[PDB]
Amino acid sequence: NALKSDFDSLRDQITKAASNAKFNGVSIANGSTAKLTFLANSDGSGFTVTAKTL
Amino acid sequence: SATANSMNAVKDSLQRGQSTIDVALAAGDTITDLLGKMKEKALAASDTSLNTASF
């Protein structure tokens, strides 16, 4: 039972860590979006980064 | 002689036209600078990683 209680507490800390992974309101790892697109040239063509949910 | 004297008015008119175009080119420098800045604004705003306040 002690090992099971430690396991569950570490599992909740994972949710805390993943939910706080934001930079000025945007995240590539908290699951809130499927991709982010950054500017690649002056015409506005994108540099996509696929989201990796954690 | 009267024909030669009337060329002074023609010269006055051509100089007036050059002055009008000079004022338009001075305004056009301002307008092209403003348009370049607006293009930079729209280019920055098209990024989706901005939060609402920056947009």
Short mmCIF file of N, CA, C and O in Angstrom, two decimals:
data_model
loop_
_atom_site.label_atom_id
_atom_site.label_comp_id
_atom_site.label_asym_id
_atom_site.label_seq_id
_atom_site.Cartn_x
_atom_site.Cartn_y
_atom_site.Cartn_z
N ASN A 1 0.82 -1.21 0.00
CA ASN A 1 0.00 0.00 0.00
C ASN A 1 0.85 1.26 0.00
O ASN A 1 0.48 2.25 -0.63
N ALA A 2 2.00 1.24 0.68
CA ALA A 2 2.87 2.41 0.66
C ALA A 2 3.42 2.67 -0.73
O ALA A 2 3.46 3.83 -1.19
N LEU A 3 3.81 1.61 -1.44
CA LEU A 3 4.30 1.80 -2.80
C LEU A 3 3.19 2.31 -3.72
O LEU A 3 3.43 3.16 -4.58
N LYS A 4 1.96 1.83 -3.52
CA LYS A 4 0.85 2.27 -4.35
C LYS A 4 0.53 3.75 -4.11
O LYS A 4 0.25 4.49 -5.06
N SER A 5 0.63 4.19 -2.86
CA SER A 5 0.37 5.59 -2.55
C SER A 5 1.43 6.50 -3.16
O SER A 5 1.11 7.56 -3.72
N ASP A 6 2.71 6.10 -3.08
CA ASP A 6 3.75 6.88 -3.75
C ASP A 6 3.51 6.94 -5.26
O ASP A 6 3.69 8.00 -5.88
N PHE A 7 3.10 5.83 -5.86
CA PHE A 7 2.86 5.79 -7.30
C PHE A 7 1.77 6.79 -7.69
O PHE A 7 1.94 7.56 -8.65
N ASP A 8 0.67 6.80 -6.95
CA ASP A 8 -0.42 7.71 -7.30
C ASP A 8 -0.02 9.17 -7.13
O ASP A 8 -0.40 10.04 -7.93
N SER A 9 0.78 9.47 -6.10
CA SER A 9 1.20 10.86 -5.92
C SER A 9 2.12 11.32 -7.05
O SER A 9 1.99 12.46 -7.54
N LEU A 10 3.03 10.46 -7.50
CA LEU A 10 3.87 10.81 -8.64
C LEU A 10 3.04 10.98 -9.92
O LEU A 10 3.32 11.86 -10.74
N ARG A 11 1.99 10.17 -10.07
CA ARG A 11 1.11 10.31 -11.22
C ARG A 11 0.43 11.68 -11.24
O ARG A 11 0.30 12.30 -12.30
N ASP A 12 0.00 12.17 -10.08
CA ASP A 12 -0.60 13.51 -10.05
C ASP A 12 0.43 14.62 -10.32
O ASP A 12 0.10 15.65 -10.95
N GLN A 13 1.67 14.43 -9.87
CA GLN A 13 2.68 15.43 -10.18
C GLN A 13 2.95 15.52 -11.68
O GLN A 13 3.32 16.59 -12.18
N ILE A 14 2.77 14.42 -12.42
CA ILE A 14 2.91 14.52 -13.88
C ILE A 14 1.90 15.50 -14.47
O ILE A 14 2.24 16.31 -15.34
N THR A 15 0.65 15.45 -14.00
CA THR A 15 -0.36 16.37 -14.51
C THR A 15 -0.01 17.81 -14.18
O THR A 15 -0.16 18.70 -15.02
N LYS A 16 0.50 18.04 -12.98
CA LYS A 16 0.93 19.40 -12.63
C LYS A 16 2.02 19.90 -13.59
O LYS A 16 1.92 21.00 -14.15
N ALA A 17 3.04 19.07 -13.82
CA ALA A 17 4.16 19.49 -14.65
C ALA A 17 3.72 19.75 -16.09
O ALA A 17 4.14 20.73 -16.70
N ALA A 18 2.88 18.88 -16.64
CA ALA A 18 2.45 19.06 -18.02
C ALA A 18 1.56 20.29 -18.17
O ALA A 18 1.66 21.01 -19.16
N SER A 19 0.70 20.55 -17.19
CA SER A 19 -0.18 21.70 -17.30
C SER A 19 0.56 23.03 -17.15
O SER A 19 0.09 24.04 -17.67
N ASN A 20 1.70 23.06 -16.47
CA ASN A 20 2.40 24.33 -16.33
C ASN A 20 3.38 24.65 -17.46
O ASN A 20 4.04 25.69 -17.40
N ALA A 21 3.48 23.82 -18.49
CA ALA A 21 4.49 24.00 -19.54
C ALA A 21 4.03 25.00 -20.60
O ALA A 21 3.80 24.66 -21.76
N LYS A 22 3.96 26.26 -20.21
CA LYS A 22 3.46 27.32 -21.07
C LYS A 22 4.41 28.50 -21.09
O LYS A 22 5.05 28.83 -20.09
N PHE A 23 4.49 29.16 -22.25
CA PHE A 23 5.30 30.36 -22.44
C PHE A 23 4.38 31.47 -22.94
O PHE A 23 3.98 31.46 -24.11
N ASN A 24 4.06 32.41 -22.06
CA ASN A 24 3.13 33.51 -22.35
C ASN A 24 1.82 33.00 -22.95
O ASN A 24 1.35 33.49 -23.98
N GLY A 25 1.23 32.00 -22.31
CA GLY A 25 -0.09 31.54 -22.66
C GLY A 25 -0.18 30.51 -23.75
O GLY A 25 -1.28 30.07 -24.07
N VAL A 26 0.94 30.11 -24.34
CA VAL A 26 0.95 29.13 -25.41
C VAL A 26 1.82 27.96 -25.00
O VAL A 26 2.78 28.11 -24.24
N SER A 27 1.48 26.78 -25.50
CA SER A 27 2.18 25.56 -25.12
C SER A 27 2.26 24.63 -26.31
O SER A 27 1.32 24.54 -27.10
N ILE A 28 3.38 23.93 -26.43
CA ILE A 28 3.53 22.88 -27.42
C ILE A 28 3.45 21.49 -26.79
O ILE A 28 3.59 20.49 -27.50
N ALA A 29 3.20 21.40 -25.49
CA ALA A 29 3.24 20.12 -24.81
C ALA A 29 2.08 19.82 -23.87
O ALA A 29 1.99 18.69 -23.39
N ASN A 30 1.20 20.78 -23.59
CA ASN A 30 0.10 20.54 -22.67
C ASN A 30 -1.15 20.00 -23.35
O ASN A 30 -2.18 19.84 -22.69
N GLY A 31 -1.10 19.73 -24.65
CA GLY A 31 -2.21 19.13 -25.37
C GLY A 31 -3.28 20.08 -25.86
O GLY A 31 -4.26 19.62 -26.43
N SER A 32 -3.12 21.39 -25.67
CA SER A 32 -4.16 22.35 -26.01
C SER A 32 -4.26 22.64 -27.50
O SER A 32 -5.26 23.21 -27.93
N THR A 33 -3.26 22.28 -28.30
CA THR A 33 -3.30 22.52 -29.73
C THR A 33 -2.54 21.40 -30.42
O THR A 33 -1.76 20.68 -29.80
N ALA A 34 -2.81 21.23 -31.71
CA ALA A 34 -2.16 20.17 -32.46
C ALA A 34 -0.84 20.59 -33.10
O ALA A 34 -0.02 19.73 -33.41
N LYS A 35 -0.63 21.89 -33.31
CA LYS A 35 0.60 22.37 -33.91
C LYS A 35 0.72 23.86 -33.68
O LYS A 35 -0.28 24.56 -33.48
N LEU A 36 1.95 24.35 -33.72
CA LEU A 36 2.22 25.77 -33.74
C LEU A 36 2.95 26.09 -35.04
O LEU A 36 3.73 25.28 -35.54
N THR A 37 2.69 27.27 -35.58
CA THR A 37 3.26 27.66 -36.86
C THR A 37 3.97 28.99 -36.69
O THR A 37 3.34 30.00 -36.37
N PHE A 38 5.27 28.99 -36.89
CA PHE A 38 6.09 30.17 -36.76
C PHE A 38 6.50 30.67 -38.14
O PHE A 38 6.52 29.92 -39.11
N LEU A 39 6.78 31.96 -38.22
CA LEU A 39 7.06 32.59 -39.50
C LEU A 39 8.35 32.07 -40.10
O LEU A 39 9.36 31.92 -39.41
N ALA A 40 8.34 31.80 -41.40
CA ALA A 40 9.53 31.35 -42.10
C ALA A 40 10.09 32.36 -43.08
O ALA A 40 11.28 32.30 -43.38
N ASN A 41 9.27 33.27 -43.60
CA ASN A 41 9.72 34.25 -44.57
C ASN A 41 8.74 35.42 -44.55
O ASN A 41 7.70 35.37 -43.91
N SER A 42 9.10 36.46 -45.30
CA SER A 42 8.35 37.70 -45.28
C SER A 42 6.99 37.59 -45.96
O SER A 42 6.16 38.48 -45.79
N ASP A 43 6.74 36.54 -46.74
CA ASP A 43 5.41 36.34 -47.30
C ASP A 43 4.44 35.75 -46.29
O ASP A 43 3.24 35.71 -46.58
N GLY A 44 4.91 35.32 -45.13
CA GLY A 44 4.06 34.69 -44.15
C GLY A 44 4.00 33.19 -44.22
O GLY A 44 3.19 32.59 -43.51
N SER A 45 4.83 32.55 -45.04
CA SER A 45 4.90 31.10 -45.05
C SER A 45 5.39 30.59 -43.70
O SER A 45 6.18 31.24 -43.01
N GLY A 46 4.88 29.44 -43.30
CA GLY A 46 5.06 28.94 -41.96
C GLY A 46 6.21 27.97 -41.77
O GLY A 46 6.70 27.35 -42.71
N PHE A 47 6.63 27.85 -40.52
CA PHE A 47 7.55 26.83 -40.05
C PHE A 47 6.77 26.07 -38.99
O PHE A 47 6.70 26.51 -37.84
N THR A 48 6.14 24.97 -39.38
CA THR A 48 5.30 24.20 -38.47
C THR A 48 6.13 23.43 -37.45
O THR A 48 7.18 22.88 -37.77
N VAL A 49 5.63 23.36 -36.22
CA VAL A 49 6.14 22.46 -35.20
C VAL A 49 4.97 21.63 -34.70
O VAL A 49 4.01 22.18 -34.15
N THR A 50 5.03 20.33 -34.93
CA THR A 50 3.99 19.43 -34.44
C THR A 50 4.00 19.38 -32.92
O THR A 50 5.06 19.25 -32.30
N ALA A 51 2.82 19.46 -32.31
CA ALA A 51 2.71 19.37 -30.87
C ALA A 51 2.98 17.95 -30.38
O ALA A 51 2.61 16.97 -31.02
N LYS A 52 3.63 17.85 -29.23
CA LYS A 52 3.98 16.58 -28.60
C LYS A 52 3.39 16.58 -27.20
O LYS A 52 4.00 17.12 -26.27
N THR A 53 2.21 15.99 -27.04
CA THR A 53 1.50 16.05 -25.78
C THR A 53 2.25 15.27 -24.70
O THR A 53 2.62 14.12 -24.90
N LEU A 54 2.40 15.88 -23.52
CA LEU A 54 3.11 15.26 -22.41
C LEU A 54 2.22 15.05 -21.19
O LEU A 54 2.72 14.73 -20.12
N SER B 1 8.38 89.23 -80.97
CA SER B 1 8.78 89.68 -79.65
C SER B 1 7.72 89.37 -78.61
O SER B 1 8.05 88.97 -77.48
N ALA B 2 6.45 89.56 -78.95
CA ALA B 2 5.39 89.21 -78.01
C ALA B 2 5.36 87.71 -77.74
O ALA B 2 5.15 87.29 -76.60
N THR B 3 5.62 86.90 -78.76
CA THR B 3 5.69 85.46 -78.55
C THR B 3 6.82 85.10 -77.61
O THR B 3 6.65 84.25 -76.73
N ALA B 4 7.99 85.73 -77.77
CA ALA B 4 9.10 85.43 -76.87
C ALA B 4 8.79 85.87 -75.44
O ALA B 4 9.14 85.17 -74.49
N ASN B 5 8.12 87.02 -75.28
CA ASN B 5 7.79 87.47 -73.93
C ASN B 5 6.79 86.56 -73.25
O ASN B 5 6.82 86.42 -72.03
N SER B 6 5.90 85.92 -74.01
CA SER B 6 4.90 85.08 -73.35
C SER B 6 5.46 83.76 -72.84
O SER B 6 4.78 83.08 -72.08
N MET B 7 6.69 83.38 -73.21
CA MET B 7 7.31 82.18 -72.66
C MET B 7 7.61 82.29 -71.16
O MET B 7 7.82 81.26 -70.51
N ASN B 8 7.64 83.50 -70.61
CA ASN B 8 7.83 83.63 -69.17
C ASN B 8 6.68 82.98 -68.40
O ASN B 8 6.90 82.33 -67.37
N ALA B 9 5.45 83.12 -68.90
CA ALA B 9 4.31 82.45 -68.27
C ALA B 9 4.39 80.93 -68.40
O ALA B 9 4.02 80.21 -67.47
N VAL B 10 4.91 80.44 -69.52
CA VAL B 10 5.08 79.00 -69.69
C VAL B 10 6.08 78.46 -68.69
O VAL B 10 5.87 77.40 -68.07
N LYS B 11 7.19 79.18 -68.49
CA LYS B 11 8.17 78.76 -67.51
C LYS B 11 7.60 78.78 -66.10
O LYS B 11 7.87 77.87 -65.30
N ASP B 12 6.79 79.79 -65.78
CA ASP B 12 6.17 79.86 -64.47
C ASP B 12 5.27 78.65 -64.23
O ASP B 12 5.30 78.04 -63.15
N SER B 13 4.51 78.25 -65.25
CA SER B 13 3.63 77.10 -65.12
C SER B 13 4.42 75.81 -64.91
O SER B 13 4.05 74.98 -64.06
N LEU B 14 5.49 75.61 -65.67
CA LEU B 14 6.26 74.38 -65.51
C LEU B 14 6.92 74.29 -64.13
O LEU B 14 6.98 73.21 -63.52
N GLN B 15 7.38 75.43 -63.60
CA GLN B 15 7.95 75.42 -62.25
C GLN B 15 6.88 75.14 -61.20
O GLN B 15 7.14 74.45 -60.21
N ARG B 16 5.66 75.64 -61.41
CA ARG B 16 4.57 75.34 -60.50
C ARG B 16 4.26 73.85 -60.49
O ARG B 16 4.00 73.27 -59.43
N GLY B 17 4.32 73.21 -61.65
CA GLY B 17 4.09 71.78 -61.70
C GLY B 17 5.17 70.99 -60.99
O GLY B 17 4.88 70.01 -60.30
N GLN B 18 6.41 71.43 -61.11
CA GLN B 18 7.49 70.76 -60.39
C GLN B 18 7.32 70.90 -58.88
O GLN B 18 7.57 69.95 -58.13
N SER B 19 6.84 72.06 -58.42
CA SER B 19 6.59 72.23 -56.98
C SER B 19 5.47 71.33 -56.48
O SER B 19 5.57 70.74 -55.39
N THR B 20 4.39 71.21 -57.25
CA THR B 20 3.29 70.34 -56.86
C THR B 20 3.74 68.89 -56.75
O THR B 20 3.42 68.19 -55.78
N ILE B 21 4.53 68.42 -57.72
CA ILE B 21 5.04 67.06 -57.63
C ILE B 21 6.01 66.90 -56.47
O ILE B 21 6.06 65.83 -55.85
N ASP B 22 6.79 67.93 -56.13
CA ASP B 22 7.69 67.82 -54.98
C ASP B 22 6.91 67.60 -53.69
O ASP B 22 7.30 66.78 -52.86
N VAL B 23 5.80 68.32 -53.52
CA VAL B 23 5.00 68.11 -52.32
C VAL B 23 4.40 66.70 -52.30
O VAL B 23 4.36 66.04 -51.25
N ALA B 24 3.98 66.20 -53.47
CA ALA B 24 3.44 64.84 -53.49
C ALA B 24 4.50 63.80 -53.15
O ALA B 24 4.21 62.82 -52.46
N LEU B 25 5.73 63.98 -53.62
CA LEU B 25 6.79 63.03 -53.29
C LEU B 25 7.16 63.07 -51.82
O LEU B 25 7.48 62.04 -51.22
N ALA B 26 7.11 64.26 -51.21
CA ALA B 26 7.35 64.35 -49.78
C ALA B 26 6.28 63.61 -48.99
O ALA B 26 6.58 62.94 -48.00
N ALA B 27 5.02 63.71 -49.41
CA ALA B 27 3.98 62.91 -48.77
C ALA B 27 4.16 61.41 -49.03
O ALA B 27 3.87 60.58 -48.16
N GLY B 28 4.67 61.05 -50.21
CA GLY B 28 4.81 59.65 -50.55
C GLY B 28 5.89 58.95 -49.76
O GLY B 28 5.79 57.75 -49.51
N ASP B 29 6.93 59.68 -49.34
CA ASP B 29 7.92 59.09 -48.45
C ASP B 29 7.28 58.65 -47.13
O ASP B 29 7.49 57.51 -46.67
N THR B 30 6.46 59.51 -46.54
CA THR B 30 5.71 59.16 -45.34
C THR B 30 4.82 57.95 -45.57
O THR B 30 4.77 57.03 -44.75
N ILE B 31 4.11 57.93 -46.70
CA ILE B 31 3.14 56.87 -46.90
C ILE B 31 3.83 55.52 -47.11
O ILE B 31 3.38 54.50 -46.57
N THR B 32 4.93 55.48 -47.87
CA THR B 32 5.62 54.20 -48.05
C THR B 32 6.25 53.70 -46.76
O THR B 32 6.25 52.49 -46.50
N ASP B 33 6.75 54.60 -45.91
CA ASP B 33 7.25 54.15 -44.61
C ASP B 33 6.13 53.58 -43.75
O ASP B 33 6.30 52.54 -43.10
N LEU B 34 4.97 54.24 -43.74
CA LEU B 34 3.85 53.74 -42.96
C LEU B 34 3.38 52.38 -43.46
O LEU B 34 3.05 51.50 -42.66
N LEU B 35 3.36 52.18 -44.78
CA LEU B 35 2.94 50.90 -45.32
C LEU B 35 3.92 49.79 -44.99
O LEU B 35 3.50 48.66 -44.73
N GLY B 36 5.22 50.08 -44.96
CA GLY B 36 6.17 49.06 -44.54
C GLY B 36 5.98 48.67 -43.09
O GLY B 36 6.03 47.48 -42.74
N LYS B 37 5.70 49.65 -42.23
CA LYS B 37 5.43 49.31 -40.84
C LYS B 37 4.14 48.51 -40.68
O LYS B 37 4.07 47.59 -39.86
N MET B 38 3.11 48.83 -41.47
CA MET B 38 1.87 48.05 -41.38
C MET B 38 2.06 46.62 -41.87
O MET B 38 1.46 45.69 -41.32
N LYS B 39 2.88 46.42 -42.89
CA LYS B 39 3.19 45.05 -43.30
C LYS B 39 3.89 44.29 -42.19
O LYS B 39 3.59 43.12 -41.95
N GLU B 40 4.80 44.95 -41.46
CA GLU B 40 5.42 44.25 -40.34
C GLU B 40 4.41 43.92 -39.25
O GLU B 40 4.49 42.84 -38.65
N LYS B 41 3.43 44.79 -39.02
CA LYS B 41 2.39 44.50 -38.02
C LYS B 41 1.55 43.29 -38.42
O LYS B 41 1.32 42.39 -37.60
N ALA B 42 1.08 43.25 -39.67
CA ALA B 42 0.26 42.11 -40.10
C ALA B 42 1.05 40.82 -40.13
O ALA B 42 0.52 39.75 -39.80
N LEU B 43 2.33 40.89 -40.51
CA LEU B 43 3.17 39.71 -40.51
C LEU B 43 3.36 39.16 -39.10
O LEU B 43 3.28 37.95 -38.89
N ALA B 44 3.59 40.04 -38.12
CA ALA B 44 3.69 39.56 -36.75
C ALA B 44 2.37 39.02 -36.22
O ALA B 44 2.36 38.03 -35.50
N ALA B 45 1.25 39.64 -36.59
CA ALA B 45 -0.05 39.19 -36.10
C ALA B 45 -0.51 37.89 -36.73
O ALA B 45 -1.40 37.24 -36.17
N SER B 46 0.04 37.48 -37.86
CA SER B 46 -0.39 36.21 -38.43
C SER B 46 0.16 34.99 -37.69
O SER B 46 -0.33 33.89 -37.91
N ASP B 47 1.17 35.16 -36.84
CA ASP B 47 1.69 34.06 -36.03
C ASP B 47 0.65 33.61 -35.01
O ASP B 47 0.05 34.44 -34.32
N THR B 48 0.45 32.30 -34.88
CA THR B 48 -0.56 31.78 -33.96
C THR B 48 -0.04 31.52 -32.56
O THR B 48 -0.83 31.17 -31.68
N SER B 49 1.25 31.68 -32.32
CA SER B 49 1.80 31.52 -30.99
C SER B 49 1.70 32.77 -30.15
O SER B 49 2.20 32.79 -29.02
N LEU B 50 1.11 33.84 -30.67
CA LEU B 50 0.86 35.04 -29.88
C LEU B 50 -0.34 34.83 -28.96
O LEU B 50 -1.30 34.17 -29.34
N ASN B 51 -0.29 35.43 -27.77
CA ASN B 51 -1.48 35.49 -26.94
C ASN B 51 -2.37 36.65 -27.37
O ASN B 51 -2.01 37.47 -28.22
N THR B 52 -3.57 36.71 -26.79
CA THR B 52 -4.58 37.66 -27.23
C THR B 52 -4.13 39.10 -27.04
O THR B 52 -4.40 39.96 -27.89
N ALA B 53 -3.43 39.39 -25.95
CA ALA B 53 -3.04 40.77 -25.69
C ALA B 53 -2.03 41.28 -26.71
O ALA B 53 -2.13 42.42 -27.18
N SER B 54 -1.08 40.43 -27.11
CA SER B 54 -0.11 40.83 -28.12
C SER B 54 -0.77 41.05 -29.47
O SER B 54 -0.44 42.01 -30.19
N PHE B 55 -1.73 40.19 -29.81
CA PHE B 55 -2.45 40.35 -31.06
C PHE B 55 -3.23 41.65 -31.09
O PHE B 55 -3.20 42.38 -32.08
#
